[PDB]
Design an enzyme around this catalytic site. Structure first.
Site, PDB file in Angstrom:
ATOM      1  N   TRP A 125      27.005  19.572  63.671  1.00 49.90           N
ATOM      2  CA  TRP A 125      26.144  20.742  63.528  1.00 49.90           C
ATOM      3  C   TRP A 125      24.788  20.248  63.011  1.00 49.90           C
ATOM      4  O   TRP A 125      24.668  19.077  62.626  1.00 49.90           O
ATOM      5  CB  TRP A 125      26.777  21.784  62.611  1.00 49.90           C
ATOM      6  CG  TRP A 125      27.251  21.228  61.319  1.00 49.90           C
ATOM      7  CD1 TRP A 125      26.490  20.960  60.224  1.00 49.90           C
ATOM      8  CD2 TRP A 125      28.599  20.872  60.965  1.00 49.90           C
ATOM      9  NE1 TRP A 125      27.275  20.456  59.206  1.00 49.90           N
ATOM     10  CE2 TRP A 125      28.570  20.385  59.640  1.00 49.90           C
ATOM     11  CE3 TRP A 125      29.825  20.911  61.641  1.00 49.90           C
ATOM     12  CZ2 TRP A 125      29.715  19.929  58.981  1.00 49.90           C
ATOM     13  CZ3 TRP A 125      30.974  20.461  60.976  1.00 49.90           C
ATOM     14  CH2 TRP A 125      30.905  19.980  59.662  1.00 49.90           C
ATOM     15  N   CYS A 160      22.858   8.214  58.975  1.00 50.01           N
ATOM     16  CA  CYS A 160      23.435   9.575  59.013  1.00 50.01           C
ATOM     17  C   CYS A 160      23.795  10.199  57.671  1.00 50.01           C
ATOM     18  O   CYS A 160      24.871   9.949  57.128  1.00 50.01           O
ATOM     19  CB  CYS A 160      24.633   9.678  59.963  1.00 50.01           C
ATOM     20  SG  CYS A 160      25.337  11.365  60.099  1.00 50.01           S
ATOM     21  N   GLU A 203      15.927  19.135  60.851  1.00 49.95           N
ATOM     22  CA  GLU A 203      15.918  18.631  62.204  1.00 49.95           C
ATOM     23  C   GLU A 203      15.190  19.600  63.130  1.00 49.95           C
ATOM     24  O   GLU A 203      14.222  19.223  63.786  1.00 49.95           O
ATOM     25  CB  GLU A 203      17.344  18.420  62.672  1.00 49.95           C
ATOM     26  CG  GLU A 203      18.036  17.300  61.960  1.00 49.95           C
ATOM     27  CD  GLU A 203      19.276  16.882  62.686  1.00 49.95           C
ATOM     28  OE1 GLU A 203      19.204  15.936  63.528  1.00 49.95           O
ATOM     29  OE2 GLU A 203      20.313  17.529  62.418  1.00 49.95           O
ATOM     30  N   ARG A 254      27.655  12.270  56.389  1.00 41.92           N
ATOM     31  CA  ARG A 254      28.906  11.495  56.459  1.00 41.92           C
ATOM     32  C   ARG A 254      29.983  11.897  55.452  1.00 41.92           C
ATOM     33  O   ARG A 254      31.029  11.253  55.409  1.00 41.92           O
ATOM     34  CB  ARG A 254      28.658   9.990  56.372  1.00 41.92           C
ATOM     35  CG  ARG A 254      27.990   9.420  57.573  1.00 41.92           C
ATOM     36  CD  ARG A 254      27.717   7.932  57.363  1.00 41.92           C
ATOM     37  NE  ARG A 254      26.579   7.679  56.476  1.00 41.92           N
ATOM     38  CZ  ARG A 254      26.037   6.481  56.269  1.00 41.92           C
ATOM     39  NH1 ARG A 254      26.522   5.409  56.876  1.00 41.92           N
ATOM     40  NH2 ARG A 254      25.004   6.354  55.450  1.00 41.92           N
TER      41      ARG A 254
HETATM   42  C1  HEM Z   1      28.408  16.982  60.748  1.00 41.23           C
HETATM   43  C2  HEM Z   1      27.132  17.189  61.078  1.00 41.23           C
HETATM   44  C3  HEM Z   1      26.095  16.044  61.047  1.00 41.23           C
HETATM   45  C4  HEM Z   1      24.906  16.085  60.460  1.00 41.23           C
HETATM   46  C5  HEM Z   1      24.297  17.261  59.678  1.00 41.23           C
HETATM   47  C6  HEM Z   1      24.264  14.819  60.682  1.00 41.23           C
HETATM   48  C7  HEM Z   1      23.022  14.455  60.263  1.00 41.23           C
HETATM   49  C8  HEM Z   1      22.316  13.399  60.792  1.00 41.23           C
HETATM   50  C9  HEM Z   1      20.878  13.305  60.817  1.00 41.23           C
HETATM   51  C10 HEM Z   1      19.942  14.397  60.256  1.00 41.23           C
HETATM   52  C11 HEM Z   1      20.553  12.132  61.384  1.00 41.23           C
HETATM   53  C12 HEM Z   1      19.131  11.574  61.636  1.00 41.23           C
HETATM   54  C13 HEM Z   1      18.491  12.414  62.735  1.00 41.23           C
HETATM   55  C14 HEM Z   1      17.098  11.956  63.064  1.00 41.23           C
HETATM   56  O1  HEM Z   1      16.213  12.037  62.172  1.00 41.23           O
HETATM   57  O2  HEM Z   1      16.883  11.517  64.232  1.00 41.23           O
HETATM   58  C15 HEM Z   1      21.794  11.458  61.739  1.00 41.23           C
HETATM   59  C16 HEM Z   1      21.898  10.224  62.325  1.00 41.23           C
HETATM   60  C17 HEM Z   1      22.987   9.662  62.933  1.00 41.23           C
HETATM   61  N1  HEM Z   1      24.214  10.269  63.084  1.00 41.23           N
HETATM   62 FE1  HEM Z   1      24.685  12.111  62.217  1.00 41.23          FE
HETATM   63  N2  HEM Z   1      25.095  14.008  61.409  1.00 41.23           N
HETATM   64  C18 HEM Z   1      26.226  14.733  61.660  1.00 41.23           C
HETATM   65  C19 HEM Z   1      27.281  14.246  62.384  1.00 41.23           C
HETATM   66  C20 HEM Z   1      27.342  13.056  63.071  1.00 41.23           C
HETATM   67  C21 HEM Z   1      28.401  12.712  63.991  1.00 41.23           C
HETATM   68  C22 HEM Z   1      29.596  13.616  64.359  1.00 41.23           C
HETATM   69  C23 HEM Z   1      28.149  11.499  64.457  1.00 41.23           C
HETATM   70  C24 HEM Z   1      29.007  10.731  65.457  1.00 41.23           C
HETATM   71  C25 HEM Z   1      30.144  10.192  65.042  1.00 41.23           C
HETATM   72  C26 HEM Z   1      26.934  11.022  63.851  1.00 41.23           C
HETATM   73  C27 HEM Z   1      26.374   9.793  64.067  1.00 41.23           C
HETATM   74  C28 HEM Z   1      25.091   9.439  63.752  1.00 41.23           C
HETATM   75  C29 HEM Z   1      24.434   8.186  64.074  1.00 41.23           C
HETATM   76  C30 HEM Z   1      25.014   6.954  64.821  1.00 41.23           C
HETATM   77  C31 HEM Z   1      23.015   8.338  63.516  1.00 41.23           C
HETATM   78  C32 HEM Z   1      21.860   7.298  63.557  1.00 41.23           C
HETATM   79  C33 HEM Z   1      21.735   6.626  64.925  1.00 41.23           C
HETATM   80  C34 HEM Z   1      20.400   5.924  64.986  1.00 41.23           C
HETATM   81  O3  HEM Z   1      19.381   6.614  65.259  1.00 41.23           O
HETATM   82  O4  HEM Z   1      20.344   4.680  64.758  1.00 41.23           O
HETATM   83  N3  HEM Z   1      26.459  11.999  63.005  1.00 41.23           N
HETATM   84  N4  HEM Z   1      22.849  12.253  61.365  1.00 41.23           N
HETATM   85  C1  LIG Z   2      25.744  14.867  66.033  1.00 40.81           C
HETATM   86  C2  LIG Z   2      24.370  15.125  65.476  1.00 40.81           C
HETATM   87  C3  LIG Z   2      24.224  15.815  64.282  1.00 40.81           C
HETATM   88  C4  LIG Z   2      22.949  16.044  63.781  1.00 40.81           C
HETATM   89  N1  LIG Z   2      22.805  16.726  62.622  1.00 40.81           N
HETATM   90  N2  LIG Z   2      21.860  15.590  64.456  1.00 40.81           N
HETATM   91  C5  LIG Z   2      21.981  14.901  65.622  1.00 40.81           C
HETATM   92  C6  LIG Z   2      20.760  14.409  66.373  1.00 40.81           C
HETATM   93  C7  LIG Z   2      20.071  13.242  65.685  1.00 40.81           C
HETATM   94  C8  LIG Z   2      20.579  11.948  66.269  1.00 40.81           C
HETATM   95  C9  LIG Z   2      21.743  11.390  65.752  1.00 40.81           C
HETATM   96  C10 LIG Z   2      22.218  10.198  66.290  1.00 40.81           C
HETATM   97  C11 LIG Z   2      21.525   9.582  67.329  1.00 40.81           C
HETATM   98  C12 LIG Z   2      20.357  10.161  67.815  1.00 40.81           C
HETATM   99  C13 LIG Z   2      19.632   9.469  68.956  1.00 40.81           C
HETATM  100  C14 LIG Z   2      18.310   8.783  68.589  1.00 40.81           C
HETATM  101  C15 LIG Z   2      17.567   8.521  69.890  1.00 40.81           C
HETATM  102  C16 LIG Z   2      17.628   7.271  70.516  1.00 40.81           C
HETATM  103  C17 LIG Z   2      16.946   7.051  71.719  1.00 40.81           C
HETATM  104  C18 LIG Z   2      17.001   5.701  72.396  1.00 40.81           C
HETATM  105  N3  LIG Z   2      16.228   8.063  72.281  1.00 40.81           N
HETATM  106  C19 LIG Z   2      16.158   9.290  71.699  1.00 40.81           C
HETATM  107  N4  LIG Z   2      15.434  10.277  72.286  1.00 40.81           N
HETATM  108  C20 LIG Z   2      16.825   9.539  70.496  1.00 40.81           C
HETATM  109  N5  LIG Z   2      19.912  11.334  67.282  1.00 40.81           N
HETATM  110  C21 LIG Z   2      23.246  14.663  66.149  1.00 40.81           C
END
Ligand code: HEM
Ligand SMILES: Cc1cc(N)nc(CCc2cccc(CCc3cc(C)nc(N)c3)n2)c1
Ligand code: HEM
Ligand SMILES: Cc1cc(N)nc(CCc2cccc(CCc3cc(C)nc(N)c3)n2)c1
Ligand SMILES: C[C@H](O)[C@H](O)[C@H]1CNc2nc(N)[nH]c(=O)c2N1
Ligand SMILES: C[C@H](O)[C@H](O)[C@H]1CNc2nc(N)[nH]c(=O)c2N1
Ligand SMILES: [Zn+2]
Lengths: 401, 404
Positions: B280, B108, B285, B111
């Site tokens: 947000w 993420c 994305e 952060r």
């Molecule tokens: C504040 C705005 C946020 C932005 C802009 C952001 C951005 C991102 C992006 C761009 C990704 C990867 C998305 C992808 O390519 O699938 C990501 C992953 C992730 N985010 Fe965020 N994020 C935000 C907030 C959060 C919040 C609030 C949480 C929950 C506490 C969170 C938890 C996670 C987790 C667990 C992943 C990776 C999970 C996985 O696929 O293994 N993020 N974040």
């Molecule tokens: C809050 C938030 C902020 C932000 N900027 N982008 C996202 C969406 C990207 C994201 C963040 C965290 C976890 C997953 C799920 C990945 C996933 C897993 C499985 C098992 N199936 C899917 N279709 C997708 N996606 C969420």
């Protein structure tokens, strides 16, 4: 044991048995993954034998007496000298395999095609430069570039290595002038001052081609001016943006990497330079607008006409695009081999593919295959890959000094 | 040197050492004999330790490490797990438990805003219906007429010998994708298997492209129920471009709030099975993953066609000319509508600054390079020239087996 390697665009699920071959380890551990990191007698026979089997298998003549009576020969040679020498044919196969085995290399579909000039019959820096003009002359082929690798003698411990002191046969010069600012290429700053040091008349043009520092086993390195004629430089223009070339920009046409070590069946050649052809982005993204380098982004856009008061304005992207394009058009115009990140990537997925059939996979540094720009917009991006160290392989070494 | 991972920034030439990784009580796929870094998909006595691991963090975070307060919290969970088998967290223990999962999670980029996170405690929810109310409430805070705040809404945990709370819809806002007869899809190729379930659990589809799915809300040992979001809650941004007028006409819209909701949040060896979080978007994305991926909205071809581009060959960079515009236009829309969103540059900066900050508190930061670096213009951004150390720390958002 054999990592499942789903592609995510197609749903293509492939399995890698090749890793089990890799007998030599890397930066990663069960608990942490240093994937992204940029740098790292009894045993010699071990690698000799194997490589020699690697060899004979290629020409399918594995097992047959020729095989074992070479395994006869090399076994003894090291058991009485400390080292051994490779036949021509052998190193050809090996130098090729190093290319085939290099996991940072997107351009691999092409590994079959490779010229392997054998320079192991060399002993003077004055012959070296010559062996290198015959290299540059053959690879440039005045437009139709061809992939080749000239190989200078092996290292043996009782003495120095042959080395090429600069990190690409062709590179532009670098001149920090009171200001703490550089006219020309800021990577090639440290190197250019050495040529000034070991005697050299410096230039000052944004792109001044440099000399060549070649050193022979124990001996002060020697300077050799590349005949300007032999250096294929490409002018730089934009296909629709007429204002452009007024910027006075360019790039050389031949990418020859000189600073790397080659490892074969244990034997290592310190200097063994090699050169395929450019992948657009390399020039127009990294080698230019990248700050740690030529850093052009700003002007390009100020020209173009874009709000640098803000990033969200997205000028840095719109700028690259055109530089990254303004490169291909010029190159395609000046008729000089060049392969674009899209063209490039497809073909690798075919390599990735074809290899899977032959060997049981192909090691690949994912973080490096994926282009410097527009990742998701290539197939490689959606393809899991496995990277592990194989062999024969290309390795880095210390800067000669 | 220091017998720990060594992390250079090849732009400022600075170095830093990861000391925190020796905290990871969880190994990944990678062995030193090959690297699976790229890869996507990755009791009692042995629960109790997981627990103590947590409390200790909680305390050595309020800085009361050593106190009776601390030594008797540990002499209570030992008591709870002993006689119960599980153990319930105290109020602000959880709030902490969430922020750490976010902070801990390697993929993420967003952060720096990590301590903003609002924890909505819903550990009382016991009706399939009540669940809906919470979720609804969430969105209104999270939406904030467009001034999107972050937030999470923990519903209760697992018991050995109970069912699971689950939120089926992977995300709280999902565009319906209807399998066409064409052999094709109208909608969002991703959210098909789910659209297909909504219909079997009793949903009458519309047939647009940006129909908003309903939620399938399970509650322990109960077939999931079906709920439709009042459209006033589900804020939506129409898409246009600052110069290319025709863009608007593409009909392209998209929704403001991401809320992930099919992810197990694990704190101290606890399992929160329905635990949905929001924030947000980061422009790319929407404008690269969602709207450009070959197997999603894949608008790239249609858009290149309009900007009048030689889509016959790749050396016209039509794709790169397109995405860029499409990615921009998506930003220019949240500028306009006063909805939250962060562009890749802006975002990828804060990350370094988070990295920089985190080097002080934890002395390390887990980062999944491939996922930290934006799907357009890698080199163009700071994060790109930065080596990184991925690893599994807890609290942790885990991936979870889909219920059916
Ligand atoms: C504040 C705005 C946020 C932005 C802009 C952001 C951005 C991102 C992006 C761009 C990704 C990867 C998305 C992808 O390519 O699938 C990501 C992953 C992730 N985010 Fe965020 N994020 C935000 C907030 C959060 C919040 C609030 C949480 C929950 C506490 C969170 C938890 C996670 C987790 C667990 C992943 C990776 C999970 C996985 O696929 O293994 N993020 N974040
Ligand atoms: C809050 C938030 C902020 C932000 N900027 N982008 C996202 C969406 C990207 C994201 C963040 C965290 C976890 C997953 C799920 C990945 C996933 C897993 C499985 C098992 N199936 C899917 N279709 C997708 N996606 C969420
Ligand atoms: C035919 C044209 C070729 C293309 C388009 C190509 C593509 C690439 C690219 C883009 C890189 C990454 C370079 C960087 O960004 O630093 C690379 C790496 C590499 N290439 Fe090539 N390649 C080509 C031919 C060759 C040839 C002929 C060799 C020599 C046998 C070679 C050996 C290597 C090696 C060893 C690496 C590893 C990079 C490192 O670890 O420093 N490539 N290739
Ligand atoms: C054949 C070839 C084809 C092609 N398209 N591009 C190149 C040039 C890019 C490149 C390819 C392979 C290796 C290196 C050297 C990178 C490096 C590494 C270290 C450790 N120090 C340096 N100074 C430079 N550079 C070479
Ligand atoms: C820090 C980062 O690992 C490093 O800059 C890598 C990332 N990916 C790359 N990818 C390519 N094609 N070429 C590169 O030089 C790099 N550099
Ligand atoms: C196969 C590939 O490694 C994988 O799908 C990754 C690549 N990089 C990514 N990067 C981001 N930000 N998001 C993603 O979904 C992906 N996909
Ligand atoms: Zn790894």
């Amino acid at each position: 044991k054999f990592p499942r390697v789903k592609n995510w665009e197609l749903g293509s699920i492939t399995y890698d048995t090749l890793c089990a071959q890799s007998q030599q380890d890397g930066p990663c551990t069960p608990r942490r993954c240093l994937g992204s990191l940029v740098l790292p007698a009894e045993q010699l026979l071990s690698q000799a034998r194997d490589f020699i089997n690697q060899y004979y298998s290629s020409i399918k003549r594995s097992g047959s007496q020729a095989h074992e009576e070479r395994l006869q020969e090399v076994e003894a040679e090291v058991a009485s000298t400390g080292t051994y020498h490779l036949r021509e044919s052998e190193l050809v196969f090996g130098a090729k395999q190093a290319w085939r085995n290099a996991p940072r290399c997107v351009g691999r579909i092409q590994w079959g095609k490779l010229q392997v000039f054998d320079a192991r019959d060399c002993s003077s820096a004055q012959e070296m430069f010559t062996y290198i003009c015959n290299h540059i002359k053959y690879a440039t082929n005045r437009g139709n570039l061809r992939s080749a690798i000239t190989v200078f003698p092996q290292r043996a411990p009782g003495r120095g290595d042959f080395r090429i002191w600069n990190s690409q046969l062709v590179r532009y010069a670098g001149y920090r002038q009171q200001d703490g600012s550089v006219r020309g290429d800021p990577a090639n700053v440290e190197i250019t001052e050495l040529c000034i040091q070991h005697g050299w008349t410096p230039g000052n043009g944004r792109f001044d081609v440099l000399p060549l520092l070649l050193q022979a086993p124990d001996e002060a390195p020697e300077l050799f001016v590349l005949p300007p004629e032999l250096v294929l430089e490409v002018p730089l223009e934009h296909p629709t943006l007429e204002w452009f070339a007024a910027l006075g920009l360019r790039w050389y046409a031949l990418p020859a990497v000189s600073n790397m070590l080659l490892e074969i069946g244990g034997l290592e050649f310190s200097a063994a330079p090699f050169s395929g052809w450019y992948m657009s982005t390399e020039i127009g993204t990294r080698n230019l607008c990248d700050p740690s380098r030529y850093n052009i982004l700003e002007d390009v856009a100020v020209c173009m006409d874009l709000d640098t008061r803000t990033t969200s304005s997205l000028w840095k992207d719109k700028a690259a695009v055109e530089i990254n394009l303004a490169v291909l058009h010029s190159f395609q115009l000046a008729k000089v081999t060049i392969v674009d990140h899209h063209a490039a990537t497809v073909s690798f997925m075919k390599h990735l593919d074809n290899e899977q059939k032959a060997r049981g996979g192909c090691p690949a540094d994912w973080a490096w295959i994926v282009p410097p720009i527009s990742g998701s917009l290539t197939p490689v991006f959606h393809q899991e890959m496995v990277n592990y160290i194989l062999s024969p392989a290309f390795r880095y070494q210390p800067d000669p000094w």
